[PDB]
Design a protein around this ligand. Sequence first.
Ligand SMILES: CC(C)C[C@H](NC(=O)[C@@H](O)[C@H](N)Cc1ccccc1)C(=O)O
Ligand SMILES: CC(C)C[C@H](NC(=O)[C@@H](O)[C@H](N)Cc1ccccc1)C(=O)O
Ligand SMILES: [Zn+2]
Ligand SMILES: [Zn+2]
Lengths: 606, 605
Amino acid sequence: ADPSSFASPEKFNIKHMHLKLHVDFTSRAIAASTSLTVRSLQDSLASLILDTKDLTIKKVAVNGKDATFALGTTHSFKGTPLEITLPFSLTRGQEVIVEIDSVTSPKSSALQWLNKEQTAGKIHPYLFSQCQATHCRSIIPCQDTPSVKFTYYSQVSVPKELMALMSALRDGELSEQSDSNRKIYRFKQNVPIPSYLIALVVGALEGRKVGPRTTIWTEKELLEPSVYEFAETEKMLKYAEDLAGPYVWGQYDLLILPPSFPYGGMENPCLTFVTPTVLAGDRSLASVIAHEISHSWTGNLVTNETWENFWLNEGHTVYLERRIDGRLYGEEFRQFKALGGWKELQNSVNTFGATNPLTNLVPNLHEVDVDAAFSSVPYEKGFALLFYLEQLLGGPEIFLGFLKSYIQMFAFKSVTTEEWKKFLYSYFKDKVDILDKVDWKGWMHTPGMPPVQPKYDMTLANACITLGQKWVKATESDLGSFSADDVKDLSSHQLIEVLAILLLEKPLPVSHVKRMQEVYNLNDVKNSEIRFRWLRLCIRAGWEDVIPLALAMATEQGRMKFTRPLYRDLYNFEKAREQTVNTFLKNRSFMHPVTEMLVAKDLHIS
Amino acid sequence: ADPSSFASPEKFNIKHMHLKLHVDFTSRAIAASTSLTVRSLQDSLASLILDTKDLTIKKVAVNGKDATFALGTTHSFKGTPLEITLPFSLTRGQEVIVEIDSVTSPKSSALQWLNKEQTAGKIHPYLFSQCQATHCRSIIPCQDTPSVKFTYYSQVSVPKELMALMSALRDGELSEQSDSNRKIYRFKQNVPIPSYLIALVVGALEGRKVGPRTTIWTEKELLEPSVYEFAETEKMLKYAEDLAGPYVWGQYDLLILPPSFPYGGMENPCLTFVTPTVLAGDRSLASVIAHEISHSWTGNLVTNETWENFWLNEGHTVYLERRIDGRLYGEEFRQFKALGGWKELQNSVNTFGATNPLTNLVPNLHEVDVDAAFSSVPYEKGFALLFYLEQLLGGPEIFLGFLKSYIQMFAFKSVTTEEWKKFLYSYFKDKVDILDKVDWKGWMHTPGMPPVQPKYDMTLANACITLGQKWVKATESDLGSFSADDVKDLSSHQLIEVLAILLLEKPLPVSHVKRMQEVYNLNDVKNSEIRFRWLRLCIRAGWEDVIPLALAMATEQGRMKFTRPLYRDLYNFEKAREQTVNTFLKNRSFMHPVTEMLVAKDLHI
Ligand SMILES: CC(C)C[C@H](NC(=O)[C@@H](O)[C@H](N)Cc1ccccc1)C(=O)O
Ligand SMILES: CC(C)C[C@H](NC(=O)[C@@H](O)[C@H](N)Cc1ccccc1)C(=O)O
Ligand SMILES: [Zn+2]
Ligand SMILES: [Zn+2]
């Protein structure tokens, strides 16, 4: 039983969904007629509990009659439970069809409605979804737990001048005989997926082929720079297939969303959603594609049972991503991204607290808001464990054999940390003595930094550690020693690392960040990862000059990784506090509901 | 798609089955309440066509409605179709639940109902099923085509001491309400399987653990020798996993059937069905386990689209089985089983005809009875192609990489030979130049022997070909030269090969088969593969003394590989013809329906 869901996967399972979605831009609504194939797992089951959040349920019908439904008490973040009385108690594992007519709220946490004024084309509105982790319940009533994987078919009614796309293969266009002003797009998803992987985009979209199974989709204005930035998608997909095995999803498309998309990348099956903030014109932030590609195996094919087991998803994907980086830029770069991961984990454990139970690899999420619980811990502590196991068991070639068999063993299924450990011991049966050496309790259920640190190559990192130390130990007299030469021989990833280590230490004087701008000219760097860290460093320093720059980056884009900390730091900055609160209220209606709720709680607004 | 089915896989797909099976031994029938989850593949579906054979359909209910159903024009072997005309036109990608109440006929081709006198001693009755290829129709209404793969859950009502087992994981024991002369044994199969892979056994069964995921099931009397004969099941399962990848079915159990089981092995998921005829007490015929284990990948996990594509299932499984035997007994033994395979193919081509289109690797089965079309061609011409490709593309290590990616590529799906050839060319993109050199037309759609013969190691075979040649070229004066020395140091597989050689050669004189008995004493060999060939050779020779021995083996065991040729040869033997016809008329009621029917074609009737 998932603590983030109201549904019981041990009682029943959704095996298939037929979705009739009516998209209305005037109402900002999605009226859904969902037909759910329910399989009973318990004998003589009388009730059916599904997850809903700000959803209006019109009617429920089980085998054509009308079933008695009842909504429970609305939880603080989990939403409202919906109970359905079945006409007959069934005989497990018996299957039945439950038809539900619902409608979303315009405030739906999963969706973002943009007027033409907000969009790039300025003629048409835009809609896009973000269901991960628990927002699918804000669109349709479901077992919104990654433990339940289902196949789906959908029909989407939209204004005829607009394009619609889903996390499925396109299955043709249909004419809406009732409304001539409308078109019906159809989609097929024959591979079982969890609810968080359901996605929908409706807008003025244009797409062009960039590979035998890759079309890049976005608004005309962003199309030309998106094809250059993500030209090597097929190469990345092929490199991943060599490592993980065959691609079972048929198609790998990309969609570049408006700047309000709350993440950098989203692995929606058949259609990866990407932020325009990675468009740096040099493909330095394009590892986001190799990461999303790798989810096609670790996450989408083999899913985490609950969000407590989220590291199985992100830790293995980060491992696969860094192996693709290995065959690309070299083993020295792979080792550097591994070491940079440790620092991001160190950066996340301090933000949450070295003692916070949320920093456990397998955390307790009972009565915990998953969106407010998001961190680099499942990513980097999860990766560190797999990279430490790799060194312990004989190298990358030997560890890849395990990962391949693991993907094959649990393909199309959901997995717990216990199943993963049982499989790890089953595979390394002759090396079981080396497995019994690892401190499993320290790795799985202990807050803070991991018990043991893996052996890393320090070739690329040495220059980053040195520069950072020089800056934190510099006085006003040493400021003159710093020059352009310090960052001139460094790559973008090397510049990210030195800034990250400066952010991890005590706040720098106003004179030092002024000296940084003087010799490094970090104010004109377009690279999002560098700029965000540079602005955050200046705010903590107490530099008043950076307030209009930090406010600019926090409002011109809506990626939570960047927007949420910039707003928090700006609020804790006394001189800026007034303007930042007033900047947020003036932009509150034009931002994503998840980003908004999280930024409003931080500012003590709500 | 399948010319053997009346169902349309392009129109709708069965995704799940909930089976409520009532088994009654007094009536010898299975009353089934099947709940089918139907997924529409067409935009506006009005009708639902399913396969049935000697089935009685009581009522059909679609989401709680008294649905109207009609049967079309009856077929000679495919069966009479069942049309369910839907009240409302289903849409593309929509799922519905179709409840059907049926009952089998006691003559059901899929089942065998053997009396308390036919079982071990005189304790309790026994029931066992055999679905492959098209007999699942004879139990439940379904899309009886391997192109449709579905998950299932079943509840079966059986007597207390008569334990029930299915091709699924056990999901606990339970009790019944009315008509209390039964007990519920429930099962769950969460891996999609084709209709030919559903299985059921009900009898006085006992089990014993021989491995973490293996328990041998048999009658107490056959239990002790079954655990010795199949002690190395886990070792074989592990050796297979090293070759094919992870075992996804959770458990691998074995069940040893009464001698009436029509085959040697049946790969039913989680519960392999094995003949008691392989119990030779030396594990010399235990490669049958390595073969059914291999089907867990090529067959169960990756299924043949139709029975025209049956070589993808049996050819790849024969290849995997011989890779396991090569690891247990060495590369020399592997090469010898391959060479012995070529000899088994030439025996089938000899029987069906060198020109018979049924001897094509991918045959046309339009208006063809699949049970009457069974041969070693999909097995051996299939294996030979894969073994010839192996030698052409760089060895076993390189060819195994292909097989591994092939299994992963098509896991949980059905495959055509066109998909297989497209995958072979994508995998060996580097060797398309050597691939375009193979005679694909000669290999896929030409009757008789394959176009090219693979290179074999002759170390173990040399002694077999020599002895056979000596026997066919011996005169009355040479008979004295033969001694025990000729066979006594040959292995059982070496003795099988020399007999197989002799059976393809011209009928031997009565004096020669009499001398064989004198120096080799082949009349007291218990090994089934040796005995069957020895008896067939003697019938071929016209030796009257072997008539009561051939009749004995043909009636004490019902494995079609042995029983069917022994009966055919005995009928074509003028002196025996009368007694053999009268011997089957006295055993007619005690045989399997698939075995008992094929005598109307062989013994003429
Ligand atoms: C590793 C990075 C390059 C990409 C990273 N994205 C991810 O890890 C995604 O695939 C995750 N799906 C992001 C996510 C996590 C939890 C809830 C909602 C969304 C991001 O920063 O957006
Ligand atoms: C090849 C041998 C090791 C065993 C052989 N059995 C098989 O090949 C099984 O896998 C077959 N699946 C048996 C079969 C074939 C066709 C129709 C119904 C049943 C047999 O002779 O019974
Ligand atoms: Zn990710
Ligand atoms: Zn077989």
